Design a protein around this ligand. Structure first.
Ligand code: NA
Ligand code: NA
Ligand code: NA
Lengths: 370, 372
């Protein structure tokens, strides 16, 4: 009855795996704060499978095709002559992940005569023009909270790796070296350091909770201030402005969206507020940081480390300078598409498709516009 | 009137640093449990300096030479014709680190005609034959707790690195790729897994404490059970034996010393007790794990990852199989010699020498063998 158009990233270069490292995933009832994890009526995958690549199909093909539907899955999403744009003109449902996002521009939404549901397998909607969606009666939905914890682990990983000098030290072991002084001449303990978070939110609070037993001093800024009880339980020190926070911090982690007042918020002028040898971890948006200002800060020693999984442009060009600068701890944009996060937003994708196709309401927390 | 012989590791291959990444170190009041940090009357370094290499000299030379002493610093420590063994003959004090250890065998101790104090700039005395020092009246001392937290951070770092597939994902980024599916085909969240610790002394307990806000389940075993209040604060599950613990664990961190009964305690037979796709982190001793048994379990998928900073043999030979095996997260032996830890055991080394040379008692908690 319906045509479903689903954009996913490519399979591994060796091919889609047949077996995985483990047999299942740890059970979890809820997210911090009580939101229950996705609750489809069933799933047709084993949790832990690769669901976000083209062959994983978010485990939706059996359920969709048993019910008469057409299911189109592709990674060709860019430009007007992509499989996505061409297939889009009679698609009823569009599904993509933020890690390989199918943009629903105003022009593309106007091309899509049949579009009814725009589904983010993942979190957020800024690949969708919401006004155009509202004007066309298109519902936009997301699997809220599905990877906030995944990102938060990635951050703490990266903070430890930068402070302790993990990546270069590992390079000496893999290369057949030893070179103890070479490893540790840039290696510190995190204990006693001051970590500052720009924005709490789901990711920022999870990061702070996870840093707390490392005996760091915890500072943060946000637009609104955490409840007094949360601040006292975690020893949080509040700042009205990030510029007031920066001079206190050995580590600064960024958790804000990209807006006109956050674009290039880390630049040559604001980096002068940071302690010599400060560390920055950025899992939010690549353009929070002036690309070349970061390179210059690493080169001068204003920063002793930079790490994150977001770039600009994204995907990063092959010669993007953050790839090979000193004291980098980068990964590709992956933190929110760990296999654990995939199981949850695949499950949430199916749950929304079920509510949608059966005419039942979609969870309020999932709905962006309707 | 004293000769202090000090073995340290080589300087970095691009020279002793003139500039450091940062100007200072965080102040730390005490260790968990209440032990005070080292209390030398003075230090002649700025904390954060590279102290454990030949040119750092643990910041000791000005202090020793101003007091009429002879201070010999070398990295040449192995073999009968090395600088260490040739200078040992009349050394009053021997100082080395476990990261480049000057071995005080019975033979060398028999040849060290004036040896009164064997000082570990670090923790332990594995490289010192204690019966020979006891027989000879030689004081053996260490800088207790100086890097227990440093090891604990390295463990949690490495658990997160293994589970989330950090090292291959960073490789994709550094080589100019992107390859999201290649990164995440072996990437998981830690959240909700079961982590088991073999022993819960200073390191293991500090690991368990740092793991708790990751919402993992925390199991442990030890020769001596933790106090009930400690178990209840962290919700620890106690196991009578290592073998009772392994089947429950997604991640196993080894924090036990090397002994006859722990040697090769991870082996082809006990690995069959682990869950398929378990992860092992080992910052304790390389020979806790049968070298090739771990490689076989990686190739089998019995383990989804192995990481640590200790090796057998140590230093690891160029073609040590853990260097290039799949899903490895290794570093050289470095966790307990971060610059922060260096500052503390350099400070503690000076504190001990000051007590020693002034004929004042050395801290009980520093003494492995009292001597005189
Ligand atoms: Na500080
Ligand atoms: Na790929
Ligand atoms: Na003293």
């Amino acid at each position: 009855s319906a045509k479903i158009l689903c954009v996913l990233y490519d399979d591994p270069v060796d091919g889609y795996p047949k077996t995985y490292a483990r047999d299942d995933l740890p059970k979890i009832d809820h997210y911090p704060g009580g939101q229950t994890l996705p609750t489809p009526k069933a799933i047709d995958f084993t949790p832990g499978a690769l669901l976000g690549s083209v062959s994983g199909e978010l485990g939706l093909r059996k359920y969709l095709e048993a019910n008469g539907h057409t299911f189109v899955v592709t990674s060709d999403k860019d430009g007007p002559d992509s499989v996505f744009e061409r297939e889009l003109v009679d698609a009823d449902v569009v599904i993509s992940q933020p890690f390989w996002p199918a943009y629903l521009t105003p022009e593309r939404i106007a091309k899509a005569k049949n579009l009814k549901l725009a589904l983010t397998a993942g979190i957020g909607s800024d690949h969708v023009d919401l006004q155009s969606a509202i004007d066309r009666g298109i519902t936009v939905a997301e699997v809220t909270y599905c990877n906030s914890i995944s990102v938060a682990e990635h951050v703490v990983m990266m903070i430890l790796g930068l402070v302790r000098n993990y990546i270069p030290s590992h390079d000496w072991a893999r290369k057949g070296g030893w070179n103890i002084a070479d490893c540790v001449e840039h290696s510190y303990d995190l204990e006693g350091m001051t970590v500052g978070s720009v924005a709490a939110g789901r990711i920022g609070l999870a990061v702070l909770r996870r840093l707390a037993p490392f005996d760091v001093k915890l500072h943060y800024t946000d637009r609104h201030r955490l409840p007094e009880a949360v601040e006292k339980e975690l020893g949080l020190v509040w700042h009205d402005t990030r510029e007031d926070m920066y001079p206190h911090c050995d580590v600064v982690t960024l958790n804000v969206p990209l807006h006109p007042e956050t674009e290039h918020m880390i630049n040559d002028e604001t980096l002068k507020l940071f302690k010599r040898g400060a560390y920055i971890v950025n899992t939010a948006r690549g353009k929070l940081a002036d690309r070349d200002a970061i390179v210059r800060a690493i080169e001068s020693g204003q920063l002793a480390g930079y790490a994150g999984d977001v770039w600009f442009p994204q995907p990063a060009p092959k010669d993007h300078p953050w790839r090979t600068m000193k004291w980098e701890g980068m990964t590709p944009h992956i933190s929110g598409t760990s296999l654990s996060a995939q199981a949850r937003y695949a499950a949430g994708t199916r749950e929304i498709l079920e509510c949608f196709f059966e005419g039942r309401p979609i969870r309020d927390e999932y709905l962006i516009v309707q």
